[PDB]
Amino acid sequence: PLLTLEEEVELARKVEEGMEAIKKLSEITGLDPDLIREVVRAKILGSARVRHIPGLKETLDPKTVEEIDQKLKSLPKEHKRYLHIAREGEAARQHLIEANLRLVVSIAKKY
Amino acid sequence: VRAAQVEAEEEGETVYLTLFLEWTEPKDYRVQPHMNVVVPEGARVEAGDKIV
DNA sequence: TATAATGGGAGCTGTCACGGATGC
């Protein structure tokens, strides 16, 4: 179903803040922000989909995402809080996309 | 409002009650759609804490 | 790169007859 102004602004906001949180989590851990994003995304979507990403300098298999998810869970409370933020931002991203999937149809019918 | 403690003094044909009261006063805050609450239900705050 | 916009459109109408896989 379609998004109420509140639901839209909320999912949007959570996305922006999870992007922020991946930046902060890179600041903290010194790992690559893209690798971070792909790990958070992996665990959000599930193991149903994990595959090698072309920009990533590392092959993204369940072994290394478990390793990096573990080294992420080994954080202080005020840092691991950013892991919870990024997870929420990824889920907001998927829900906002799937919400606005009908705008695409109404726009491509004229093409 | 509740009367925590009650001190009394006798004087002439009366008493004067020095009541140590404790009570809660409400204030409303209207939220707009562009806004978000940062506080759970029934959660206590102090002077300067963020509500919305 | 920033008003806001949120589920498509055809279809095509006059064969005939089998075999062989699928529902009361």
UniProtKB/Swiss-Prot annotation, chain B:
Subunit structure as annotated in this protein's UniProt entry: The RNAP catalytic core consists of 2 alpha, 1 beta, 1 beta' and 1 omega subunit. When a sigma factor is associated with the core the holoenzyme is formed, which can initiate transcription.
Function, as annotated: DNA-dependent RNA polymerase catalyzes the transcription of DNA into RNA using the four ribonucleoside triphosphates as substrates.
Sequence similarity: Belongs to the RNA polymerase beta' chain family.
Protein name according to UniProt: DNA-directed RNA polymerase subunit beta'
Species name: Thermus thermophilus (strain ATCC 27634 / DSM 579 / HB8)
